[PDB]
């Protein structure tokens, strides 16, 4: 429901441990823009989901465009954070992007 | 010289950012036992050396056996420490190991 935020999932990757990053924001699953999105950020996501370490951090909607709101932009994780929510970013819903820039991750546990 | 301790290096990894962990102790480069050695401990070493975050924390002398003293055992970093010296351990030179257990790290900055 609309009171709930701060869940994380990967979609459209064909595997539990890769795909487009989606973040729950006020009942809607939103996406993350690829601006400043890098393997440090992907590693927080991969570790948070128990998927190993980040092998790469694809941009440009490699795993498709989402249909929800764009909720995070210019994420600046160091790679050591325990939650994506802990990393610096632009502020929720503050972006300069479109869904052709939706960010993704490929984690080391893919396929296995 | 023999008065100096508390420097950190990785050796025998083929890259600056992976290898056997070695710790300077009274002028000699010593090793770390793999007992309780995990990715939280590796994360502290990797960040201390400017090598990023930890991919894994290999035990059992993956990067060979050292020849110096075994100086640290049962290291229990939380992951947040800025120095390996901050982490809980068994006490300097207090170990129940041999060099076939020398600990190593593999950090994200390994590159080709
Ligand atoms: Cl993991
Ligand atoms: Cl070691
Ligand atoms: Mg972009
Ligand atoms: Mg970033
Ligand atoms: Mg932007
Ligand atoms: Mg052991
Ligand atoms: Mg430990
Ligand atoms: Mg021991």
Author numbering:
A (entry chain B), B (entry chain A): 986 to 1097
Publication text:
The salivary scavenger and agglutinin (SALSA), also known as gp340, “deleted in malignant brain tumors 1” (DMBT1) and salivary agglutinin (SAG), is a multifunctional molecule found in high abundance on human mucosal surfaces. SALSA has widespread functions in innate immunity, inflammation, epithelial homeostasis, and tumour suppression. The first 13 SRCRs are 109 aa domains found as “pearls on a string” separated by SRCR-interspersed domains (SIDs). The SALSA SRCR domains reveal a classic globular SRCR-fold, with four conserved disulphide bridges, as described for the SRCR type B domains.
